[PDB]
Structure formats: structure tokens, C-alpha cells
Amino acid sequence: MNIFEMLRIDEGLRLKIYKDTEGYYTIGIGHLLTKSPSLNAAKPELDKAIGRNTNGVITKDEAEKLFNQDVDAAVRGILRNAKLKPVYDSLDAVRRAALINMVFQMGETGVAGFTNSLRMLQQKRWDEAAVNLAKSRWYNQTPNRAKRVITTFRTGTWDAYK
């Protein structure tokens, strides 16, 4: 198991514009297109992302290409973030994947916002960090995915995904 297979299980794959759990226009492997309500504001963002007139549908290859970019950008965002970087550096390889997953879903700003949990992770207080991460809108809105991520932070193994 690796970050790619982990996010592929959490986000699924859809070749046609769809709405995410929050109601936003998305395509492929969790690639957010726009927070705007218009499918007309979404279609152009999609064409611009792919480099072609797509008419709202893309191929598997195109989806995977957006995915590689999005994972690369998540990592690079963590490393440029003054609050995230020190946490990431402190972690083992499995748990680093868990932080990348959070960043991919909620963005760097959001994650950097979990001040207390981040401090607990850095101190390696696993059980306490898992309890604090659960007290969030994130966990209440997407409980099954959140529990998988949380379990990965608590245990440091890929069990929740096996």
C-alpha cells in the first residue's frame, strides 16, 4: 500500500463531472474543479485543466494525470508550510501518508488549522491525537474516511485499508 492506492480507495474514480460530498463540482480522483454552483463555471475549469474541449468527460489516463499532479502539489504544500513541515518531518512513512491524505481532502490551510492535534502528533501521543482529531466537522461529515485516516495515525500501519 502507498499514498496513491490509499487516496484511490478514499476518493474513488469517476470519469464524468460529479458532485463531491459537500456538493462541489469534481472529476477523476477527487480533483475539485470549482466551488461555484454553475456547471457552466465547472465545464471551463475542466477544459482548462485538461488542455482540451472535453464536454465534461475525460479518460482514465487524463484522470490519472490530474491525480499525479494533485499528490505532488499536496506534498509540496506540506513542505512549504511552516506549521506542517515540522510535523511531516517528525513522522514515520505510514503516518506521513495519513497527513498527505488530510491535506489532499481539505487543503493545507484547513489542516494547518488543527493546531492541537498537530502538536500531539509531533509529540507522538497517538491515542490522544486520535481522540482530538475526532472532534471535528471533518469527522462528523465523512466519518468512515476520517476513521480510516485516524486509525492510520493511531497505529502506524495500513490495517484500516486492508
45 is an active site residue? no
36 is in an annotated binding site: no
Shortest Å, Cβ 146 to Cl ion: 7
Question: Is 145 an interacting residue with respect to Cl ion (CB under 5 A)?
Answer: yes
Binding window for Cl ion (CB under 5 A); candidates: 2-10, 33-41, 90-98, 140-148: 140-148
Give the largest Cα separation in the chain, rounded: 50
Note if 64 is an active site residue: no
Which among 81, 64, 2 is positioned nearest to 27, based on CA atoms? 64
Least Å distance between CB 37 and Cl ion?
Answer: 20
Which residue's CB is nearer to Cl ion, number 148 or number 154? 148
132 is in an annotated binding site: yes
Query: Is 40 known as a binding-site position?
Result: no
Binding site for Cl ion (CB under 5 A): 49, 142, 144-145
